[PDB]
Structures are given as structure tokens and as C-alpha cells.
Design a protein around this ligand. Sequence first.
Ligand code: HEM
Length: 87
Amino acid sequence: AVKYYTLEEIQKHNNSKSTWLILHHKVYDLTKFLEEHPGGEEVLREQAGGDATENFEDVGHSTDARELSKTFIIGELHPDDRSKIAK
Ligand code: HEM
């Protein structure tokens, strides 16, 4: 069974103590990845707590980066919150 989180829940994880973001409806805990990310901490920091899909896609990310992202998945956006934000 898939763990869901709402937007309101995710929105709280917006700082160094706990940073989550959403990509393509998956929820990622990037708390430790922030200082590993090749693209730096501040671009993650600026989108913390919400959907970052467009920005992730707009800047481009390798296949290797997309495979790496799977390692930080902690759950999925609640179905009733999908109409807000795009997959
Ligand atoms: C869990 C999610 C993420 C993973 C694993 C990840 C991983 C990476 C990796 C491995 C690179 C090096 C280049 C590449 O392989 O394409 C990269 C570069 C970059 N990332 Fe991410 N990234 C993530 C999320 C994001 C997000 C959400 C943003 C923007 C808000 C972002 C912005 C950038 C930028 C600006 C670069 C530099 C592009 C370049 O090399 O020219 N990344 N990322």
C-alpha cells in the first residue's frame, strides 16, 4: 500500500531540518541530498515543500539523475490533491 501525503503535509517540510519536494506526483525526502546535489542546495531550497516537476524538467536531468531520484521516494501525493498542482 502506497503511502500518500497531502499538499498541506508536504508543505511543512521546507527547511534544512526536513526538505521534501514533489516530482511527477512522487514525494521525495531530500534532507540529506541537499548537500550532495550536483546542481547545488539553493535550487532545491527554493522549491522545498511543494511541486518542483517543471523546474526539474526545464533544467534537464540525465537518466542517471532520474534513476538516483528514486532512492529518495517516501510516498506519493494524495489522489485528491493531484488536480492541483500536473503529473
Ligand atoms: C531527487 C531529485 C533530484 C536529483 C536526484 C537530482 C540530481 C541531479 C544530478 C545527478 C545532476 C547532475 C546533472 C545530471 O545528471 O543531469 C543535477 C543537476 C542539476 N539539478 Fe538536479 N536533481 C534533483 C532535483 C532537482 C530540482 C528539483 C532542481 C530544480 C529545482 C534541480 C536543479 C538542478 C540544476 C540546476 C542542475 C545543474 C544542471 C547542469 O549540470 O547543468 N535538480 N541534478
